[PDB]
């Protein structure tokens, strides 16, 4: 205080606005919804992209009902995700995108390996990670109309062997909601919320933000103590 | 001659159990913890409030042995201001508690832009100085009188009638009935909005809340139901200590306090301790 | 086809060129280190602090 | 970088006048200004600072409770306000540019100053020589004197270097006793020890030639020196 | 039988490498100091705290002049802090958040800065308008980006997880030169204290050690069991020690083309995330998952000297060129300086 000179004193003031600016920026930023993008090689996320109204990480914006939503799509980064995957770990929600009507095509060199196999596959390793204990998975299901319209003629017996039902679309679209909703392993920290997109079906955001929501309030009652 | 037996093993218990607590609760709060977003800081005024109603016992407990009042005018005001003041900023920080969990839940998102630093301190200075103004009433009542052949004793001396039922009633509603309808009200609110989302929580969140009513309940009740019982028969008429019923009320007026004193005891396990919102649950040097 | 035998090639190239290098004994780099360990060991202010009139950082 | 001044004129005895200074070039809101006042005969002397953020603010001895000084950052701009103009109001104006984080040099830029014509623990600088008679190609030295000692504790040295040529504004030469402007050559130099320090210039050149001051930053206010007059 | 002539060949040069390391070993580092007296305890005090960094911490450098650092976190923000005051004395916020490595010229007129964009970003500090602007960007790598060092105001060189390291001259912005040979991602580099050669490791669990000038690998380097997460270089210039995810940390002479020492310990089961070396180089730190980092004596194989302090993982740490303080940072953005 009274051993400074008059140059160490302008330099305190200097670095005590910083601080202040440093602080407004970082109260500004904790309003953000930070959600992640996910779906395997050519499942529909493209048109869930455009539906909304929107190398390296590709970064959207958008903005609904006064919040702000950014989106991150990290599909071309073609290395190892154990290097890169934990900095993610913070984010609000985890969008997902499957195909319904893939079932009976060939994805490999290998004939084996379907497509639908594949997405359980990527699902199940995405869902138990050891840095998403606790974070919620909002799943899509896409070309509901082509599957339907695939049915008629191509029964699901093709890709799942112990199938014992009808074939008409309702119980195949259940069936396979339920497949997937069998794979969560951490049944009391998470949740999962499942939709049926169709194009003229706008609802598929309005979707997204009622799930935001519920996430939000559960955070709040791990603030204020009461969990 | 009951009383003096029952008082001293109430306010004895209530020293035992209410200091160590407190005291490590700020401990760890002020002196490891490297950042303190906003719950820390209530819990730790909370704590504050508490010690300062138990660091005044002892005084009490000498005028309950030795029979006489042996530390003046000046100790008599100033005790009685202290446990005054600290009482009253206790039950306003828990008022202010639930309202915050209630609007938490109300609109997620309108309290994510205001809970913050700033708004908090305001909100807590805000307290305190209510609290000091509350208070006031204390420090120019309690007088000190000689009890008999060399004894004296400080107690109030009011005036007349009317002032007493003022003094009374005033305290009653001030200190007791807004308090516990807002933290009812809040609580209900809360537990009913909790119904449609769609998400797995009823293990040990409703046990909590249901403690707290009754804590406060327990032991704040009975204290503000003889201060109504003594306003109504002073202005009937009637004269503290004529009769029986004068006696039996005045009689049960030196160990009811002694009773609250014990709801400073409970408040660190029920806020820091208990599972459910576990700030402190998990840092413990008790093993 | 023939680009493994390019590939192929081209290790066996640098597995050759890494094949002819002149070497010493362990016994001399351990020596080697150890002289420059010793000789700068006065001028280390980690390993002997130094009077705490001359600490920057007090 | 550009700095231009305005609002200079004849003012009579008493009366007020505001001075204004535009700012283009460079980020004006990062930087604390100087006020600085020349006579039209004399050397230099300080009038008034104000800081970046604008929470501190100085004034001189002679000037306090008259002078105000004031920033728009919004429009980059600069104010000074004057009232009760005395007969010692009689001089030119310059607006000056300063930074101070560690490493920076102050007192890097001046303006063109404005005229205006009008109808003690304070540190003593002493310019011993006042004029010094050279030809070019030779080598000079001056030197000038404190009172007190301005070497602190952290191991700094405040004291600072201008040139004046003329018809100019003046121009830095040396911020803390050794260190170069930049854009300055490398025949300039800078030295000394407490209370005396020495410039010292090597093969002169011509546009080399005005008037060199002395100054201290220690402590507030700010000093000048006198001046020395080399002549060729 | 050509693919299978050639993969023999390259076997019979593998074993004939084998056998030329195997005959030039004669005696263990442990054994030639065995009458080294041991350096006793050794116990540093926390001197400063530096505070403003609202997220994780992913990198910090030392300036030559011993007195300025720069430190990058998630939040979007690159910090220029005065270490004797604690004052701050340049904040810069970047284009891209996910920011993973800092460099500091050794001049003092540059910093640069890249990330999970796939460009290099160069900044310069000294201007004639009292900001800090961006200098060039440098583009052409296909992977994330996780190191960078310079070596003068002009040159730079980069290593990505392409499996490519590269040389860039900053005033064309062009690709110099490209290093190309490991098999999985490249994670740090290394330069020498005289700008000639440079070391590199990678998630193959294998370092090379590079020539510059020339645009060719020298040699390399194996023994560990996962990737290597860290690497540095000895002061004398024969030497460098990594750092891998088993746990371990070991030290490798470029002379005597051999390993020297390994540095584990059995109540150890965790990743080192950083390592670095002393003026004189007799202490070895290394910073771990436990959330806190080990000094290790660096000729005999034995100490752990904790600087426990940090609440999460350390991702970074640093030691001055005069030798007196020592830096660390970790996830809970914090950095504290020790001596
Ligand atoms: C469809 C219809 C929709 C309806 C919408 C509303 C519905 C339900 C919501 C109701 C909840 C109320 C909102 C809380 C206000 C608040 O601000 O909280 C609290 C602020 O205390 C106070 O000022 C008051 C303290 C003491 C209570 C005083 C109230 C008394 C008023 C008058 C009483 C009259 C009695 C009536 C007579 C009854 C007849 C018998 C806790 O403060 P605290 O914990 O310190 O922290 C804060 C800061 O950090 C941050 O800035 C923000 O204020 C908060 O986020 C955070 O709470
Ligand atoms: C023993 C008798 C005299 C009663 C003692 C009264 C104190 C126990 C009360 C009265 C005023 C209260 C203070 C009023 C204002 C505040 C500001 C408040 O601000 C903060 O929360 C600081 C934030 C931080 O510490 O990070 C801290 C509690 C404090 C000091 C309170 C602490 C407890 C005080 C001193
Ligand atoms: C006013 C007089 C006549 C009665 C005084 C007692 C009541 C004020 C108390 C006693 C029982 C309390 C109730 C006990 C249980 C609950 C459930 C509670 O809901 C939850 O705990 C939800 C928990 C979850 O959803 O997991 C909401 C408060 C409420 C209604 C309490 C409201 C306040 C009550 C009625
Ligand atoms: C049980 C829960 C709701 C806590 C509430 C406690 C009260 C119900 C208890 C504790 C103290 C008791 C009192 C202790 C002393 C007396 C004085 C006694 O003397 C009289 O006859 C006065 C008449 C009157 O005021 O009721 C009447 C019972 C009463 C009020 C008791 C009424 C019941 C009280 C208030
Ligand atoms: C909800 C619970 C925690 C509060 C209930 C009050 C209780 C704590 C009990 C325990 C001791 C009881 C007291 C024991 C002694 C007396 C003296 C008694 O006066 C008599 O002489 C009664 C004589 C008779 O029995 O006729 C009046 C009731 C009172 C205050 C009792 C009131 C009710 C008390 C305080
Ligand atoms: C938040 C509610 C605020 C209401 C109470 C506030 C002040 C009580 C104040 O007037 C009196 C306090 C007395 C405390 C202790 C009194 C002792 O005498 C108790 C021992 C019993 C005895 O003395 O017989």
């Not at chain 1, 119980?171 to 997109?197: P, S």
């Not at chain 2, 707290?212 to 003594?230: C, G, K, Q, R, S």
């Not at chain 4, 929470?55 to 009232?83: C, E, H, W």
């Not at chain 5, 060719?216 to 002061?235: K, L, V, W, Y």
Request: positive net charge; proline residues 3%; contains cysteine.
């Amino acid at each position: 205080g009274c051993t400074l000179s008059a140059e160490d004193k302008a330099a305190v003031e200097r670095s005590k606005m910083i601080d202040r600016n440093l602080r407004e920026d970082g109260e500004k930023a904790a309003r953000e919804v930070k959600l992640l993008l996910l779906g395997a090689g050519e499942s529909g996320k493209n048109t869930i992209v455009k539906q909304m109204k929107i190398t390296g990480i590709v970064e959207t914006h958008f903005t609904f009902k006064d919040l702000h939503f950014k989106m991150f799509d990290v599909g071309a980064q073609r290395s190892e995700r154990k290097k890169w995957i934990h900095c993610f770990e913070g984010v609000t929600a985890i969008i997902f995108c499957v195909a319904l009507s893939d079932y009976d095509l060939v994805l490999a060199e290998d004939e084996e390996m379907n497509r639908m196999h594949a997405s359980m596959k990527l699902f199940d390793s995405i869902c138990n990670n050891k840095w998403f204990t606790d974070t919620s998975i909002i799943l899509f299901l896409n070309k509901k109309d082509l599957f339907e319209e695939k049915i008629k003629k191509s029964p699901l017996t093709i890709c799942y062997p112990e199938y014992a039902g009808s074939n008409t679309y309702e119980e195949a679209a259940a069936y396979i909601q339920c497949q997937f909703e069998d794979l969560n392993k951490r049944k009391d920290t998470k949740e999962i919320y499942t939709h049926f997109t169709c194009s003229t079906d706008t609802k598929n955001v309005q979707f997204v933000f009622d799930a935001v929501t519920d996430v939000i309030i559960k955070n709040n009652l791990k603030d204020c103590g009461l969990f | 001659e009951f009383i003096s037996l029952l008082a001293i093993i109430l306010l004895s218990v209530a020293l035992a159990v209410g200091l160590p607590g407190n005291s490590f609760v700020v401990w760890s709060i002020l002196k490891r913890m490297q950042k303190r977003s906003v719950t820390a800081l209530m819990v730790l005024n909370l704590a504050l409030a508490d010690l300062a109603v138990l660091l005044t016992a002892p005084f009490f407990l000498h005028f309950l042995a030795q029979g006489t009042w042996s530390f003046g005018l000046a100790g008599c005001r100033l005790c009685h201001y202290v446990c005054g003041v600290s009482m009253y900023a206790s039950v306003w920080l828990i008022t202010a508690m639930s309202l915050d969990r209630s609007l938490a839940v109300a609109r997620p998102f309108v309290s994510q832009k205001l809970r913050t630093k700033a708004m908090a301190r305001r909100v807590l200075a805000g307290i305190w100085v209510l609290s000091f103004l509350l208070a006031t009433p204390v420090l120019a009542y309690r007088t000190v009188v000689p009890w008999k052949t060399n004894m004296s004793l400080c107690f109030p001396r009011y005036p007349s009638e009317g002032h007493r039922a003022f003094h009374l009633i005033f305290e009653a509603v001030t200190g007791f009935l807004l308090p516990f309808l807002i933290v009812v009200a809040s609580y209900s609110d809360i537990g009913r909005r909790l119904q449609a989302r769609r998400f797995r929580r009823s293990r040990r969140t409703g046990r909590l809340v249901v403690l707290i009513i009754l804590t406060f309940a327990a032991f704040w009740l009975p204290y503000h139901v003889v201060n109504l019982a003594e306003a109504g028969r002073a202005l009937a008429g009637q004269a503290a200590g004529l009769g029986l019923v004068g006696k039996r009320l005045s009689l049960a007026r030196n160990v009811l306090i002694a009773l609250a004193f014990l709801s400073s005891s409970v408040n660190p396990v029920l806020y820091a301790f208990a599972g459910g919102g576990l700030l402190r649950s998990a840092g413990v040097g008790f093993v | 086809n023939t680009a493994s035998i390019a590939q192929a090639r081209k290790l066996v190239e640098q597995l050759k060129m890494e094949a002819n290098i002149d070497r010493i004994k362990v016994s001399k780099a351990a020596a080697d280190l150890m002289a420059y360990c010793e000789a700068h060991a006065k001028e280390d202010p980690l390993l002997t602090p130094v009077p705490a009139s001359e600490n920057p950082f007090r | 970088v550009q700095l231009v001044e305005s609002g200079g004129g004849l003012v009579q005895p008493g009366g007020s006048r505001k001075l204004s200074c535009s700012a283009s070039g460079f980020a004006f809101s990062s930087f604390g200004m100087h006020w600085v006042r020349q006579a039209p005969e004399k050397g230099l002397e300080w009038v008034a600072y104000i800081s970046s953020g604008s929470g501190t603010i100085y004034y001189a001895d002679t000037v306090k409770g008259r002078f105000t000084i004031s920033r728009d950052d919004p429009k980059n701009t600069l104010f000074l306000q004057m009232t009760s103009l005395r007969s010692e109001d009689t001089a030119m104006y310059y607006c000056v540019r300063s930074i101070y984080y560690y490493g920076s040099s102050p007192f890097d830029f001046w303006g063109q100053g404005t005229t205006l014509t009008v109808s003690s623990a304070d540190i003593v600088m002493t310019q011993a020589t006042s004029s010094v008679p050279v030809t070019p190609g030779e080598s000079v030295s001056i030197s000038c004197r404190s009172s007190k000692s301005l070497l602190h504790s952290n191991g700094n040295t405040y004291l600072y270097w201008f040139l004046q040529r003329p018809g100019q504004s003046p121009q830095l030469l040396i911020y803390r006793m050794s260190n170069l402007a930049s854009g300055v050559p490398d025949r300039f130099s800078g030295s000394g020890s407490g209370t005396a320090f020495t410039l010292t210039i090597s093969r002169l050149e011509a546009e080399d030639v005005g008037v060199y001051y002395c100054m201290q930053h220690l402590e507030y206010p700010l000093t000048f020196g006198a001046g020395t007059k080399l002549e060729l | 039988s050509e693919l299978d002539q050639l993969r023999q060949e390259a076997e019979q040069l593998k074993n004939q490498i084998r056998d030329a390391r195997k005959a030039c070993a004669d005696a263990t580092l442990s054994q030639i100091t065995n009458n080294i007296d041991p350096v006793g305890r050794i116990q540093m005090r926390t001197r400063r705290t530096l505070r403003g960094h609202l997220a994780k911490i992913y990198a910090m450098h030392w300036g030559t002049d011993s007195r300025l650092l720069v430190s990058a976190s998630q939040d979007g923000k690159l910090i220029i802090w005065d270490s004797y005051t604690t004052n701050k004395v340049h904040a810069i916020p970047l284009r891209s958040s996910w920011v993973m490595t800092c460099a500091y010229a050794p001049s003092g007129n540059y910093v640069a800065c890249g990330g999970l964009d796939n460009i290099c970003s160069i900044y310069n500090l000294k201007t004639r308008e009292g900001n800090v602007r961006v200098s060039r960007e440098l583009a052409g790598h296909t992977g994330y980006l996780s190191c960078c060092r310079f070596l003068d105001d002009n040159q730079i060189v980069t290593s990505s997880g392409d499996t490519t390291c590269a040389l860039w001259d900053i005033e064309t912005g062009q690709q110099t030169t490209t290093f190309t040979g490991h098999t999985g991602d490249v994670m740090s580099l290394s330069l020498a204290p005289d700008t000639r050669l440079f070391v590199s490791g990678a998630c193959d669990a294998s370092a090379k050690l590079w020539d510059v000038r020339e645009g060719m690998c020298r040699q390399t380097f194996t023994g560990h069991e996962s990737d290597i997460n860290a690497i540095c270089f000895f002061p004398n210039g024969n030497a460098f020690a990594t750092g891998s995810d088993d746990a371990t940390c070991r030290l490798f002479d470029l002379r005597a083309d051999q390993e020297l020492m390994t540095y584990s310990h059995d109540n150890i089961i965790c990743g080192i995330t950083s390592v670095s070396f002393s003026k004189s180089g007799r202490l070895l730190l290394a910073g771990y998952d436990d959330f806190n980092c080990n000094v290790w004596d660096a000729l005999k194989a034995d100490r752990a000297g904790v600087l426990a302090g940090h609440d999460n993982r350390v991702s970074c740490l640093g030691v001055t060129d005069d030798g007196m303080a020592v830096a660390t940072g970790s996830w809970d953005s914090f950095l504290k300086i020790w001596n």
